[PDB]
């Protein structure tokens, strides 16, 4: 419920930054990170009673979030950081 809106909020800030400065290129790395989440939400909400396979894909979700942390921190360098700092802090504070 939260992250798919946080991404578009950052995207507003990223367009606003692109008006006044160089970066409009770290936006493509967010739409993929958003679209991939549906590929898990489908199965997680396809459930009616739960399954053992969801551990397998919860691991894929968790390791992917841990990966995405590194992709954000890579985009943080060479680019305005504070917009990335808050999404990072929210993901860290709700691990």
């Amino acid at each position: 419920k939260w992250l798919p809106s946080l991404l578009d909020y950052a995207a507003q800030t990223l367009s606003v930054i692109s008006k006044y400065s160089a970066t409009s290129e770290q936006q493509k790395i967010l739409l993929d990170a958003k679209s991939t989440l549906s590929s898990f939400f489908v199965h997680f909400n396809s459930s009616r009673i739960f399954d053992s396979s969801f551990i397998e894909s919860y691991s894929r979700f968790e390791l992917f979030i841990n990966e995405l942390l590194k992709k954000l921190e890579n985009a943080k360098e060479t680019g305005n950081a504070f917009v990335f700092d808050i999404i990072i802090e929210w993901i860290k504070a709700n691990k």
Binding site: V16, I17, Y20, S21, N80, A81, F82, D85
Partner: protein, 330 residues
């Protein structure tokens, strides 16, 4: 003679005048030229506070010619100085006359906000960003001239905050005053609408570029800056480095270098001031360490009886001249 003129307080005045003393004018004729430059630059503020945003590209050139000039005054070149002084007098008086032909008297909005962005970035580094933000501010350029040409011997911010203060560099009072002035942006005269908006676009362009300067732990930076100034004093007073050595090795070492009465102060107000700086998480911890750091160096620079180390050089020349004179006569 020594029984009456002796002192007790400040003995290392000569030890600071030799290491904290910047290039200054070496001749009276250049001192007067320097004074003319300063009075001219002080009047230049009076027209800087009255032009519009499009004019802020020639003022960028004026902010550089002052550097070229105050560089040249300490070269002690006085030929082309009075020349170009007159050129800039003509330019400034031109724009002063243009100031009188303005029916829309510009009123500087967001000025306290740009000033407080400058208070965050008033560093020898990132003076290009200070230089981008001067014309919106209320900054006497004589201070900006001490950044691209570093003539400061202390943290520069101190030349700003006291006026006729220090809280906005340790709080969010700036970021609140935006929202107040952002809502009261309206209910204003249209004259102030094709000039206020251009400040806000420029303000977005500014605060993004100055963002990483904001998020630093400002209680950690002034701590570390205090250490980087305080580690140096003790190295001068006692050769070595207290990033290499322990406090008790150094306390014994003062007697090998220095008298006793001042070593008292060197441990009575100075070492414990560092002992607090090492352990400074709160801000009272900074204030205690720093107020004592202040109290110390008024007791090594300040004598009980009159004493100027510059006069020591200005006396030896006279004796050399007089013994030359007597030898010539002989």
């Amino acid at each position: 003679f020594t029984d009456v003129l002796q002192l007790s307080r400040g003995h290392s005045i000569t030890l600071l005048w030799d290491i904290f003393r910047k290039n200054y004018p070496t001749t009276s004729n250049s001192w007067l030229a320097f004074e003319k430059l300063i009075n001219l630059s002080e009047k230049f503020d009076k027209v800087r506070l009255l032009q519009f945003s499009e004019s802020y590209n020639s003022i960028k050139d004026l902010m550089d010619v002052f550097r070229l000039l105050n560089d040249d005054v300490l070269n002690n070149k006085l030929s082309e100085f009075n020349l170009l002084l007159s050129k800039l007098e003509d330019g400034i008086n031109e724009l002063e006359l243009i100031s009188n032909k303005f029916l829309n008297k510009r009123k500087h909005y967001f000025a306290d906000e740009f000033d407080n962005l400058i208070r965050y970035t008033f560093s020898v580094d990132t003076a290009e960003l200070i230089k981008e933000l001067a014309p919106a501010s209320s900054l006497a350029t004589q201070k900006l001239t001490k950044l691209i040409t570093n003539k400061y011997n202390y943290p520069p911010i101190f030349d700003v905050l006291w006026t006729e203060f220090t809280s906005t560099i340790f709080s969010s009072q700036f970021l609140e005053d935006v929202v107040r002035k952002s809502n009261n942006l309206k209910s204003f005269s249209g004259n102030q609408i094709k000039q206020s908006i251009s400040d806000a676009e420029l303000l977005l362009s500014s605060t993004i570029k100055c963002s990483p300067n904001l998020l630093k732990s400002q209680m950690e930076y002034y701590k570390n800056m205090l250490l980087s100034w305080l580690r140096k004093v003790i190295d001068i007073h006692v050769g070595g480095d207290c990033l290499k050595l322990t406090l008790k090795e150094l306390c014994s070492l003062i007697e090998e270098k220095t008298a006793s009465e001042t070593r008292v102060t060197f441990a009575e107000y100075i070492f414990p001031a560092l002992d607090l700086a090492e352990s400074s998480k709160s801000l009272e911890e900074l204030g205690e360490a720093w107020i004592t750091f202040g109290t110390g160096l008024l007791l090594l620079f300040v004598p009980d009886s009159p004493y100027d180390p510059a006069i020591h050089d200005y006396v030896l020349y006279d004796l050399f001249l007089k013994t030359k004179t007597f030898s010539q006569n002989l």
